[PDB]
Structures are given as structure tokens and as C-alpha cells.
Design an enzyme around this catalytic site. Structure first.
Site, PDB file in Angstrom:
ATOM      1  N   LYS A 131     -62.474  44.613-137.397  1.00 39.73           N
ATOM      2  CA  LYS A 131     -63.383  44.122-138.425  1.00 39.73           C
ATOM      3  C   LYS A 131     -64.678  44.924-138.491  1.00 39.73           C
ATOM      4  CE  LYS A 131     -63.047  39.680-137.675  1.00 39.73           C
ATOM      5  NZ  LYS A 131     -63.052  38.192-137.705  1.00 39.73           N
ATOM      6  N   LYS A 153     -39.027  49.605-137.074  1.00 37.34           N
ATOM      7  CA  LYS A 153     -40.383  49.553-137.608  1.00 37.34           C
ATOM      8  C   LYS A 153     -41.120  50.862-137.360  1.00 37.34           C
ATOM      9  CE  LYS A 153     -40.273  46.098-134.851  1.00 37.34           C
ATOM     10  NZ  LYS A 153     -39.122  45.158-134.741  1.00 37.34           N
ATOM     11  N   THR A 154     -40.953  51.429-136.163  1.00 36.88           N
ATOM     12  CA  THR A 154     -41.666  52.647-135.798  1.00 36.88           C
ATOM     13  C   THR A 154     -41.455  53.739-136.840  1.00 36.88           C
ATOM     14  OG1 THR A 154     -41.336  52.059-133.471  1.00 36.88           O
ATOM     15  CG2 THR A 154     -42.028  54.315-133.958  1.00 36.88           C
ATOM     16  N   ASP A 210     -48.925  51.092-132.540  1.00 36.28           N
ATOM     17  CA  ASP A 210     -47.544  50.647-132.424  1.00 36.28           C
ATOM     18  C   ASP A 210     -47.328  49.842-131.145  1.00 36.28           C
ATOM     19  OD1 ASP A 210     -44.552  51.024-131.595  1.00 36.28           O
ATOM     20  OD2 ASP A 210     -44.602  51.582-133.714  1.00 36.28           O
ATOM     21  N   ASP A 211     -46.439  48.849-131.228  1.00 36.65           N
ATOM     22  CA  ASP A 211     -46.055  48.011-130.087  1.00 36.65           C
ATOM     23  C   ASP A 211     -47.247  47.241-129.510  1.00 36.65           C
ATOM     24  OD1 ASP A 211     -43.184  49.624-128.468  1.00 36.65           O
ATOM     25  OD2 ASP A 211     -43.575  49.065-130.553  1.00 36.65           O
ATOM     26  N   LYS A 248     -30.370  50.683-135.151  1.00 40.00           N
ATOM     27  CA  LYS A 248     -30.292  51.367-133.846  1.00 40.00           C
ATOM     28  C   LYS A 248     -29.010  50.922-133.190  1.00 40.00           C
ATOM     29  CE  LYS A 248     -34.218  51.340-131.199  1.00 40.00           C
ATOM     30  NZ  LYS A 248     -35.438  50.676-130.686  1.00 40.00           N
TER      31      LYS A 248
HETATM   32  N1  LIG Z   1     -33.600  53.847-143.020  1.00 43.60           N
HETATM   33  C1  LIG Z   1     -33.947  53.870-141.729  1.00 43.60           C
HETATM   34  N2  LIG Z   1     -34.909  53.021-141.307  1.00 43.60           N
HETATM   35  C2  LIG Z   1     -35.259  53.036-140.018  1.00 43.60           C
HETATM   36  N3  LIG Z   1     -34.784  53.799-139.031  1.00 43.60           N
HETATM   37  C3  LIG Z   1     -33.833  54.627-139.476  1.00 43.60           C
HETATM   38  C4  LIG Z   1     -33.365  54.727-140.776  1.00 43.60           C
HETATM   39  N4  LIG Z   1     -32.378  55.697-140.868  1.00 43.60           N
HETATM   40  C5  LIG Z   1     -32.273  56.150-139.643  1.00 43.60           C
HETATM   41  N5  LIG Z   1     -33.123  55.552-138.750  1.00 43.60           N
HETATM   42  C6  LIG Z   1     -33.239  55.838-137.326  1.00 43.60           C
HETATM   43  O1  LIG Z   1     -33.158  54.596-136.654  1.00 43.60           O
HETATM   44  C7  LIG Z   1     -34.122  54.534-135.577  1.00 43.60           C
HETATM   45  C8  LIG Z   1     -35.172  53.541-135.997  1.00 43.60           C
HETATM   46  O2  LIG Z   1     -35.561  52.756-134.849  1.00 43.60           O
HETATM   47  P1  LIG Z   1     -36.486  53.357-133.721  1.00 43.60           P
HETATM   48  O3  LIG Z   1     -35.727  54.314-132.891  1.00 43.60           O
HETATM   49  O4  LIG Z   1     -37.741  53.914-134.389  1.00 43.60           O
HETATM   50  O5  LIG Z   1     -36.931  52.075-132.888  1.00 43.60           O
HETATM   51  P2  LIG Z   1     -37.607  50.668-133.197  1.00 43.60           P
HETATM   52  O6  LIG Z   1     -36.609  49.626-133.507  1.00 43.60           O
HETATM   53  O7  LIG Z   1     -38.679  50.901-134.261  1.00 43.60           O
HETATM   54  O8  LIG Z   1     -38.359  50.361-131.834  1.00 43.60           O
HETATM   55  P3  LIG Z   1     -38.997  49.131-131.046  1.00 43.60           P
HETATM   56  O9  LIG Z   1     -37.848  48.580-130.202  1.00 43.60           O
HETATM   57  O10 LIG Z   1     -40.172  49.574-130.246  1.00 43.60           O
HETATM   58  O11 LIG Z   1     -39.345  48.116-132.138  1.00 43.60           O
HETATM   59  C9  LIG Z   1     -34.698  55.944-135.514  1.00 43.60           C
HETATM   60  O12 LIG Z   1     -33.731  56.724-134.825  1.00 43.60           O
HETATM   61  C10 LIG Z   1     -34.616  56.382-136.971  1.00 43.60           C
HETATM   62  O13 LIG Z   1     -34.436  57.791-136.948  1.00 43.60           O
END
Ligand SMILES: Nc1ncnc2c1ncn2[C@@H]1O[C@H](COP(=O)(O)OP(=O)(O)OP(=O)(O)O)[C@@H](O)[C@H]1O
Ligand SMILES: Nc1ncnc2c1ncn2[C@@H]1O[C@H](COP(=O)(O)OP(=O)(O)OP(=O)(O)O)[C@@H](O)[C@H]1O
Ligand SMILES: Nc1ncnc2c1ncn2[C@@H]1O[C@H](COP(=O)(O)OP(=O)(O)O)[C@@H](O)[C@H]1O
Ligand SMILES: Nc1ncnc2c1ncn2[C@@H]1O[C@H](COP(=O)(O)OP(=O)(O)O)[C@@H](O)[C@H]1O
Lengths: 536, 427
Positions: free
Chosen positions: A427, A345-346, A399-400, A504
């Protein structure tokens, strides 16, 4: 009869740009009475204005104005007080100092009357001396005496009509109420940050003495410079120009063997647009808003399209940003993202945010207030939201949420102050004619449902996991690993069932797999994928 | 007559190059091009970085290098008085000569230098500290006005140094007042070699050093070893060597006969390394001795498996990108031996920087203290290319007596957010 303005003057000569409205305004409420034929003014039954306050962000040229207004006038050189320089150890001499230099006007008024030359006084950073009466309960109480002395001196039983005071400050919320009122310091004025057109004006003003001697390559263009330069102050632009000049000159010097400067390349000195860009990206760094580095840190490994859901999410975000940009019935919008952990999501939030092309962006992440207390977190939220209000359109990505507030399932136990702070903040419409977007992320929808927060957000978006063999094969192809033969066997043993995982997780597993020998890597990876076996 | 080798500061080439380019460029290029230009000269430099990199030496030498009057020095909060309106007077006295020289000559003035050791001591964020008397805010305002006021100056240059680069007030670090700010960090292998070469020059000149000692071994064997600490080591080992000759216990006596020939051998350096000097951002042998008490014995297959798995993870962290952070959790039943093994893994990772955080050194603390200690340890760990940090008995670090249950949340939040914080890009 003598004109109060120098016979030779010019608005372009002084060299200030982007503050035309402000310059026009003060004159209207200030110098308008001192240029017209005296007869009507004497029939007018009016007293000229006395006192002007200039307050705003640091280094914004606030002082330049004072200098060129002092220079413009066809009067005596003004008197300046470089901050609290009027303090004396002896008892009763601070009041004597502040009263002295305020009486040349008295003498000249009592001498001629209604025909005396304008007097001018400057009080840099008035805030050092003038402060709340009854506050600063320290010792010797001299400041509370000096403030009263001033108040009375500038306006009291005695009248004066040939004195103009000017003061600049950085904390306009600390001055004595009385002072800032009609009669005393009046027509309060606020210096704000420039727009892109102002940036272009400043750059052109500061880049006039170089083009006039064939010193600049035709390659450079100013429109780009105005574009990249975001959240910049005039001082920052001047520093950027200075850095470009310095780096351009340095090419002709030699070091480490004493100082040498060739007098041959010297005569062919030229500055390059690329050099400007390099300097811009390397040394100068604004201190208002976010920078490319923040995004480069959040979105680490970029984005890959392994399926249509990402495109759908991006389209929805584009529609949202367009609506908020063009809509006028709804000055406020909010969108809640949802998904299981390790979906990314981040990164998607950060990307949609960056793509908005808004002036003021900011990212408030939990990992910038470790160990703080509730009050500190609330104040930080307050300040961050406060800054946004002073722009025209902006987007903040909180975020979070489930961390900003802690939902340890045991209990449950969740702080209460933070929750209410947010539920209120979400709001509060901003001042008139301004627009904001608040993009939030989370990973536990049901809890938010219980907290009756899910009805404050305007809408919602869902981010799924990878749940199909074809999608996994596409992702592996895009990454470029375990390919050829490896890919040949993986597709063989995967398509006959379903999968469920976040990107991830896949990345870390792929990495771990490669770290084994090249005689058993595929085995390792496939084995691991089974261990993580689950479903909704 | 000046050169970069003479000074003797070795290993900071890039920083010196940039400072020369950004602060002594417009003063070197011929003033005709500067006249046709409008390059107002820069009037602020700031230095910061962990102790032991000798921020001062830099300043001293750069000041010497100039050829336009000696510098004026302020030692900490020296400019302070109890009579009202005196510290500001002392501040103003600093710039009088420069103002006079500018008035009399204008564009033909020499350079004036001002040095502010521990600038943070007096300069600090306004509106926060309890200026009961108010001298601090007044001094800050006076400096801010004097540096850049209605009147303009072009022949002054201020250098400030501080180990805490946050309490400095933002108003002073804008491009107008202070432009160039530099971090000085730990040295690299090549920097260590350069430093050791310098410190041990006269010694080689007078044939006082045995060929028995080699410099490459000294450079390699010492890691994350602050340069100052290199100098310290050299000096200590030398002292030991020269003592060996002296024979006197109750009545002082010098054996001139044995003093006819003097040289230093490896053994002195080895002894000094073992016993005398103890780095701070380095590694210490005490903890390993205090944790793995009765050693390690292989009583069955599982131990080898565990050790193998450990080194796999180590390899991955050392030789991979896209995943600069990796974390592993060990668990088992009680009184099983799930503590020492982690220390053994860490000792086998051969990383330059290792550290162990335990509840043992925090007993009786309160929550805020526990959070601060954790933050400090991880902050220190953040400053190296590689690292290995051990946390023992997370349970007690949080407190979890089963009744209730009852536990502190602040520590849990901290540890959670923490585990997912990227290192400074590049490590
Ligand atoms: N299409 C994509 N969508 C999302 N992330 C991607 C994509 N392609 C590559 N990535 C990589 O995957 C990771 C996305 O997850 P990130 O590291 O932001 O954690 P998260 O799941 O958002 O965190 P949290 O656990 O706080 O929810 C980043 O390394 C991003 O660079
Ligand atoms: N092969 C081995 N494996 C584990 N411990 C060993 C081995 N050989 C010797 N020991 C000894 O066993 C002890 C390990 O005790 P340890 O503190 O690890 O127990 P623990 O219950 O895990 O600790 P804690 O209570 O801190 O969780 C040490 O004295 C160690 O030297
Ligand atoms: N409109 C402008 N035109 C030209 N220069 C500007 C303008 N606004 C800001 N500057 C730059 O800002 C600097 C002046 O900052 P200043 O207002 O003196 O800071 P402070 O308000 O803290 O005293 C100058 O270097 C100047 O080049
Ligand atoms: N590059 C270097 N080469 C040689 N010696 C160095 C170098 N950097 C620092 N030192 C040494 O480290 C010590 C630094 O002392 P000092 O400048 O007082 O430290 P700090 O300013 O960090 O408190 C001195 O012995 C100095 O000679």
C-alpha cells in the site's frame, strides 16, 4: 581580460551524449560568474561556488565528465588524488600532505588577489578518506584528524576564491554531513541510468570512426540495437562494440599452427549485423534487471491453448497492464491469481509479465533465499522494491506467497514479520509520477482470507483445471502423442464421463506412459488416469 | 616459436580459443587497422571453477607463451604491512615500470602481465567485512582507482583466479575493468583420453610401458575423475610398480640386477585404483558396503516388482526431456527393510555420481547447520550431467516426537522448496 575558456572549444568535440541537462545545470550554478564582464560581478557582492558531488551507479561515465571538464578549462592542469594516496606512517604527516597543495591558491591570492587563475582539485572516491566522525573506532584515529584538517582548510577564518574541488563516489550515504553543505561541497548532483535515446546517442558517438572509412556494412541499423539493449550502461555498449569488432577481425586469423594472418582478406574486412546480434546474445550480459534466460527457465515448455479460459486470462492481464500504463488517478495496482495446485500459475504470470514491454522487470521467487532468516528475507524484499522506485514504470511478480511465509497446517505456525512487511509494502505508493504493478500467485485462497490479506489486493483472477473430455483430446492433439489408433481408443473410453486434472500432472503421466512397451502403452496411460480420480 | 600442443594442456580447446579471440586479437592484427579503428585493448581476465581442474597451469603456460618480459607475481595476501599507508605503496610499485615505458615510447610498448593467485583473499565485497583496521576497503579502493583512473593505460593485463566467485566485489567485474570471466569444469571422456596421452609420453618414448596396458580401458573405467586425479593415479601406480623391484626391510638395498628391465603392467593400475586414489566428485564403494549389510534375498514376489519399478524410473530420467527432474518416495511399516533397497536401486542406476545423506553424520547439529549441509550436498550434486541422491529417514531429518507435536519448520521449508529446483539447464 583573458577568457577563462579556450578560444577553440566545442561541445561535440568532447564526446559526451545524453547528459545535456546535467551539463547545462552545473554551468548555470558554476561557470556563469567567470565569463561575464567582471564589473557587474564586483558590484554583485557574491562569492563563486566551491565544491560539487557526483554520485550514482557504477561505470556510468561519472569519471568521463571530470576528465573533459578538466580539459575544457583554459587554466592550469588540475591536481588529482587517486583515492587515499595521502597517508603517511609518521605522526602528523597525513595532515601535512593534505594541507600541502592547498596553498598554491593561498600564495597566488595573497599575491595578485581577485585576478588569479582558477585552481582545480580532484578527489577520486572521496569515501576512502572522508567518513563519519566518531565512527571507525579502530586505532591511530588519523582519519578523524584529516577530516577536520580538510574542513578547516577549504573554509575557515582564512578566505579563498580561486579553488574548485570535484569528488566522485559510489556510496553518498557515508560522507560527513558538514562537508556536504552550503559553502563546502555544494549543489549535490546525481548521475542516473540512460534512456533509449541516450543509448542511441552513445552508440552513434562510439560508431563514428568506422562509418567514416567504409568499414561497416549497410545491413546494420542502429534502431534495433537501441531496442534490444535494455538496462545497459555506456560501458556495456562500448564493450559490445569492442566484442563485435574482435569477432569480426578474428575471421581472418589462423591458430593451432602458430599465428597466421592473411593479408588478402584483410583488405576486405567488414562487420555484420548478424555477428553483432550473436555477440550480443552470447557474451555481454547486463547486471540490472532480468534477462531472457530467466523467462526461458520459468516458462519451460511454453504455452498451449487447450480452451478459452487461458485466452480470457490473457485478455484480463492485457486490460490491467493497459490501464496501469495509461491511468493517472491510480499510480498503483495489484492482482491476485488463484488456482488449485499444478495449474501452471507461474507460467501464465511470467508470460503476462514479459508481454508488458516495460523497462524494468524482475521476478522474486522463493528459491533464491534457501535457509535464510526472517531479517534477510525482509532486507531482500526491501532492496528489490527499492530498485523499482528509481524507474518510471515496472512490474514485479511475487510468486508462491504461501512459501515466502510458511503455513504448515499444524498449529497453525506462520512467521509474522514477513506477513506484516508485505501487507504494508502493498500500500506504499511510489514517488510522484511513477507506476508499478505487483502480480502475485498462490494456491490456498481461504488461508489468505483468514489473514485479512484478501482486501489489500485490488482484484482477483481464477485459473481452472481441465475438466472435459473434449479439452483433454485437444490438449493431446496439441502435444502430439498417443495419436492415430491410440487417439481412436482413448476418445472411445473417456467421453462418457468427466475429468479433473492439471496440465503438469498430465505431462508427467504422458511421459511415464511412453516409457512402457509399444504393445501396452495406451493401457498403461488409461489405467493411470483412473488412479487419479477425484472432484471438487 | 610457440604451438598449442607443446604446452601440454589437453581438453580445454574451446576456452583457450575464446580467450585468444577476446584478449590477444587486437594485439595480433596489424596496427594499421587498429589505428583506423578505436579498439581499446582489454585489461581484465577472471577464472573460476571447482578444485582439481588446474586453473594455475593454464595461467603459467599462457604467461610463458608471450614474448614481452616475464610476469610479476603476487602470492596471496603478500602485500600487507602494519605501518599505515604501506600496502597501497606496494600496490602502486607494481605499475611504475609500465607507466614509465608508456611515457617514454607510448604506442611502441611491450605487454606487462600481472597474476593474482587467490584474488578473493584480498579482494572482497566492500561495506560488509569488518575492516576494524580498514586495510581491506582501502586496498580495494586503491586497486579500483589505479586500474581505471583519470589516467589511461593500454599495455597491462591482469589475470585473477578464485574458487569462490561471489565475494568478489561487483565494482571490479564491470566491462571497464574485467570483461572475460571463465568457468573451468570437470573433463569429458575425450579430455580424459587427451590427458592420459600427455602424462604418459616420455614413458612410451623409452619403451618403459608394457603393451599389456590399454588407454581406452583407463579412460572408460574412470568417470567424473578430475584430471589432476588422473595424473595422481598414473604417478601412484608407477611408484608401486617401481617399488616391486626393491627388496629391503631394515637395511635399505636396491636390486640393480632386477632394475635392468623395468615395465608397468595393468595389475599396478588396478591396485592403485582400488586402494590409493579416492575421487571426490566420483563414487565410493564404502557406503554401499556399510548400508546393504546382509545382502538381498528374494523371499516373495513384491521385491521383484519394487526393483522393476525402480529401474523404470531410472530409465525415464536418463532418456527423456521436458522432465529433467523426477522424485519417488518409498514407505512402509517399521523394521521392515525400507532402507537398503534404496541403496541397491542407486547402485543399479550406474550413474557416474551417487551420494547418500543421512542424519548419522549430523547428530547434535542445530538447524542452520542442517540447512547448510543439505544445501552443500545438493550444490555439489548440481555439477554433473547425471546424479542420484538418497535421503534416508526424512522423519528424523525433521524431528517429529508425537507429543505436541513438536518439529522444526526451517528444515521442512528447505526440503520443500528444494525438491522443485531445476538443475543447471542441460542436466
Ligand atoms: N497453456 C499453458 N498454461 C500453463 N502452463 C503450460 C501451458 N502449456 C504448457 N505449460 C507448461 O506447464 C507447466 C506449468 O506449470 P509450472 O511448471 O509453471 O508449475 P505451477 O503449477 O505454476 O507451480 P506451483 O506448484 O508452484 O503452483 C510449465 O511447464 C509450462 O511450460
Ligand atoms: N530382501 C531383503 N529385503 C530387505 N532387507 C533385506 C533383504 N535381505 C537382507 N536384508 C537386510 O535387511 C536389513 C534392512 O534393514 P533396514 O535398515 O532397511 O530396515 P528399516 O527399518 O527400513 O531401516 P530404518 O530404520 O533406517 O528405516 C539389511 O541388513 C539388509 O541387508
Ligand atoms: N555519456 C557517455 N558518453 C560516452 N561514453 C560513456 C558515457 N557514459 C558512460 N560511458 C562509458 O563508460 C565508461 C566510463 O566509466 P566511468 O564513469 O569511468 O566508471 P566509474 O564511474 O566507475 O569510474 C567509458 O568506457 C565510456 O565509454
Ligand atoms: N588439461 C590438463 N591436462 C593435463 N594435466 C592437467 C590438466 N588440467 C590440470 N592438469 C593437472 O592438474 C594439476 C593442477 O594443479 P594446479 O594448477 O595447482 O591446480 P589448481 O590451480 O586447480 O589448484 C596439475 O598436476 C596439472 O598438470
Amino acid at each position: 581580460r583573458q577568457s577563462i575558456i579556450n578560444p577553440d572549444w566545442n561541445f561535440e568535440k568532447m564526446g559526451i551524449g545524453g547528459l545535456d541537462k546535467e551539463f547545462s545545470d552545473i554551468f548555470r550554478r558554476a561557470f556563469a560568474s567567470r565569463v561575464f564582464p567582471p564589473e557587474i560581478v564586483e558590484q554583485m557582492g557574491c562569492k563563486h561556488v566551491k565544491g560539487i558531488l557526483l554520485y550514482g551507479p557504477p561505470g556510468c561515465g561519472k569519471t568521463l565528465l571530470a576528465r573533459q571538464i578538466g580539459k575544457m578549462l583554459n587554466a592550469r592542469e588540475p591536481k588529482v588524488v587517486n583515492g587515499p594516496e595521502i597517508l603517511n606512517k609518521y605522526v602528523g604527516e597525513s595532515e601535512a600532505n593534505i594541507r600541502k597543495l592547498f596553498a598554491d591558491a593561498e600564495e597566488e591570492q595573497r599575491r595578485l588577489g581577485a585576478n588569479s587563475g582558477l585552481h582545480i582539485i580532484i578527489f577520486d572516491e572521496i569515501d576512502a578518506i572522508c567518513k563519519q566522525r566518531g565512527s571507525m573506532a579502530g586505532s591511530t584515529g588519523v582519519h578523524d584528524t584529516v577530516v577536520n584538517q580538510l574542513l578547516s582548510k577549504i573554509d575557515g577564518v582564512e578566505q579563498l576564491n580561486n579553488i574548485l574541488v570535484i569528488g566522485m563516489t559510489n556510496r553518498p550515504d557515508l560522507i560527513d554531513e558538514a562537508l556536504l553543505r552550503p559553502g563546502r561541497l555544494e549543489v549535490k548532483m546525481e548521475i542516473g541510468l540512460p534512456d533509449e535515446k541516450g543509448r542511441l546517442q552513445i552508440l552513434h558517438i562510439h560508431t563514428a570512426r568506422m562509418r567514416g572509412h567504409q568499414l561497416l556494412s549497410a545491413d546494420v541499423d542502429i534502431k534495433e540495437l537501441a531496442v534490444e539493449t535494455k538496462n545497459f550502461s555506456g560501458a556495456e555498449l562500448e564493450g559490445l562494440v569492442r566484442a563485435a569488432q574482435s569477432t569480426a577481425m578474428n575471421r581472418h586469423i589462423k591458430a593451432s599452427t602458430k599465428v597466421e594472418v592473411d593479408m588478402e582478406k584483410a583488405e576486405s574486412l567488414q562487420v555484420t549485423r548478424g555477428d553483432f546480434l550473436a555477440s550480443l546474445e552470447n557474451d555481454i550480459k547486463p547486471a540490472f534487471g532480468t534477462n531472457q534466460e530467466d523467462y526461458a527457465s520459468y516458462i519451460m515448455n511454453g504455452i498451449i491453448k487447450w480452451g478459452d479460459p487461458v485466452t480470457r486470462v490473457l485478455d484480463d492481464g492485457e486490460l490491467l497492464v493497459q490501464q496501469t500504463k495509461n491511468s493517472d488517478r491510480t499510480p498503483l495496482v495489484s492482482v491476485l491469481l488463484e488456482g488449485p495446485p499444478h495449474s501452471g500459475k507461474t507460467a501464465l504470470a511470467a508470460k503476462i509479465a514479459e508481454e508488458s514491454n516495460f523497462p524494468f522487470i524482475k521476478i522474486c521467487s522463493p528459491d533464491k533465499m534457501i535457509g535464510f532468516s526472517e531479517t534477510a528475507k525482509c532486507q531482500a524484499m526491501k532492496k528489490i522494491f527499492d530498485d523499482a522506485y528509481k524507474s518510471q514504470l515496472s512490474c514485479v511478480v511475487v510468486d508462491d506467497i504461501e512459501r515466502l511465509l510458511d503455513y504448515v497446517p499444524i498449529g497453525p505456525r506462520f512467521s509474522n514479520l514477513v506477513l506484516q512487511a508485505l501487507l504494508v509494502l502493498l500500500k506504499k505508493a511510489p514517488p510522484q509520477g511513477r507506476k508499478l504493478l505487483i502480480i502475485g500467485t498462490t494456491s490456498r485462497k481461504d488461508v489468505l482470507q483468514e489473514m485479512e490479506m484478501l482486501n489489500a489486493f485490488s482484484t482477483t483472477i481464477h485459473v481452472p483445471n481441465i475438466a472435459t473430455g473434449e479439452q483433454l483430446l485437444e490438449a493431446l492433439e496439441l502435444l502430439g502423442n498417443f495419436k492415430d489408433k491410440e487417439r481412436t481408443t482413448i476418445a472411445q473410453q473417456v467421453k462418457g464421463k468427466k475429468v479433473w486434472i492439471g496440465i503438469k500432472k498430465l505431462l508427467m503421466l504422458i511421459e511415464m506412459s511412453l516409457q512402457m512397451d509399444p504393445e501396452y502403452r495406451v493401457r498403461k496411460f488409461l489405467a493411470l488416469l483412473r488412479e487419479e480420480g477425484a472432484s471438487p
